[PDB]
């Protein structure tokens, strides 16, 4: 199926405490694979997945140099935006960007994107057409106007169609044993008493890759989406993910509720129940 | 793999 290359980038000012913190974190499908952090003792691009050992020293030097240039760009941007919004020098502000591309199973571009926020709100984004921008506000309208006159969108589109997809293909090739694997969830149900002759049933799904999963609880073949509590799917420290979902049910009637787990590594979905 | 970003 399809894959994505995504960089999450953040620049955060800290007046009185020196230069902004600047970070780039790169993912191929839900797996962290590279990082730059300006606060590191010796800031350089670093591999975050084992298969990135396949890149030569030239990769790390060039991406380090690009990160450092990017860092200086965002430093400038933070001062620029202070003026656009008429804000004082004394406050901390944050710029965020998500940038990258998605390809189909045949390696071809499906979607490119580049979206910026300031202080946690939409700022500007490249439209799906890869030719125009949407600006959330009048500050971002200034940026839009600059990028239009400089041909920034065509520059970005050449990156997205070219470099972004070509490198994503290479990462998928080099990292294939990791990136194209499936790790099947293992599930279980826990039980906790409540006041009022009621009971929490919690369905866990552990050790799975990729992150996409569905957990439901059923009674009489109907899903109880309304009454479930859940946590967002979450990383577990070793490149796998976990999730839980719970339902509150009457004491003595636990045996009528069934958790269902759907996932790529489950040829047939799991059905389980509390087992005393 | 990452873009060289433009200033805003």
């Amino acid at each position: 199926g399809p894959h994505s290359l995504r960089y999450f980038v953040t620049a955060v000012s800290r007046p009185g405490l020196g230069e902004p913190r600047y970070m780039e974190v790169g993912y191929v499908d839900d797996t962290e694979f590279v990082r730059f952090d300006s606060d590191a003792e010796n800031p350089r691009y670093e591999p975050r997945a084992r298969w990135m050992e396949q890149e030569g020293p030239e990769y790390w030097e060039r991406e380090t140099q690009k990160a450092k240039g990017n860092e200086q760009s965002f430093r400038v941007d933070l001062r620029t935006l202070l003026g656009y919004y008429n804000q004082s020098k004394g406050g901390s502000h944050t710029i965020q960007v998500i940038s990258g591309c998605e390809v189909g199973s045949d390696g071809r571009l499906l979607r490119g994107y580049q979206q910026y926020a300031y202080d946690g709100c939409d700022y500007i984004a490249l439209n799906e057409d890869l030719k125009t921008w949407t600006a959330a506000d009048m500050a971002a309208l200034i940026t839009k106007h600059k990028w239009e006159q400089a041909g920034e969108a065509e520059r970005l589109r050449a990156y997205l169609e070219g470099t972004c997809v070509e490198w994503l293909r290479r990462y998928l090739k080099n990292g294939n044993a990791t990136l194209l694997r499936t790790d099947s969830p293992k599930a279980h149900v826990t039980h906790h008493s409540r006041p009022e002759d009621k009971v929490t049933l919690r369905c866990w799904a552990l050790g799975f890759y990729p992150a996409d999963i569905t957990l439901t609880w059923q009674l009489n073949g109907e899903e109880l989406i309304q009454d479930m509590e859940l946590v967002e799917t979450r990383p577990a420290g070793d490149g796998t993910f976990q999730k839980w979902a719970s339902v509150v049910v009457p004491l003595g009637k636990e045996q009528y509720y069934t958790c269902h787990v759907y996932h790529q590594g489950l040829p047939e979905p799991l059905t389980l129940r509390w087992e005393p | 793999a990452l873009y060289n970003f433009a200033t805003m």
């Binding site: 279980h188 919690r202 552990l206 946590v231 990383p235 577990a236 | -």
Partner: protein, 99 residues
């Protein structure tokens, strides 16, 4: 804009005393990004904690994983303590082995 962190503490494997495992503290849905995240064993800071999986959601809120190798024991208590501008006092979530 200010969003209070949701803090989640959990092991990679169901815990068994004496068996190596990974403890995780996932800190999510926060803004602004400045944050202190400390993992604790019996009230004392755990030294070699890896920070990973920094991302943002669609609403731009920050997510980040703190994690460390560990071997649970029956008496050991683990927790995650988070300091962020959205809260006057640091917030601690304890690892609940039976959750």
């Amino acid at each position: 804009i200010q969003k209070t962190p949701q803090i989640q503490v959990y092991s990679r494997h169901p815990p068994e005393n004496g068996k190596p495992n990974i403890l995780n503290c996932y800190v999510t849905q926060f803004h602004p990004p400045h944050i202190e995240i400390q993992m604790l064993k019996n009230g004392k800071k755990i030294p070699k904690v890896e920070m990973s999986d920094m991302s943002f959601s669609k609403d731009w809120s920050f997510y980040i994983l703190a994690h460390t190798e560990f071997t649970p024991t029956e008496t050991d208590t683990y927790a995650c303590r988070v300091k962020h501008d959205s809260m006057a006092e640091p917030k601690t979530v304890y690892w609940d082995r039976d959750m």
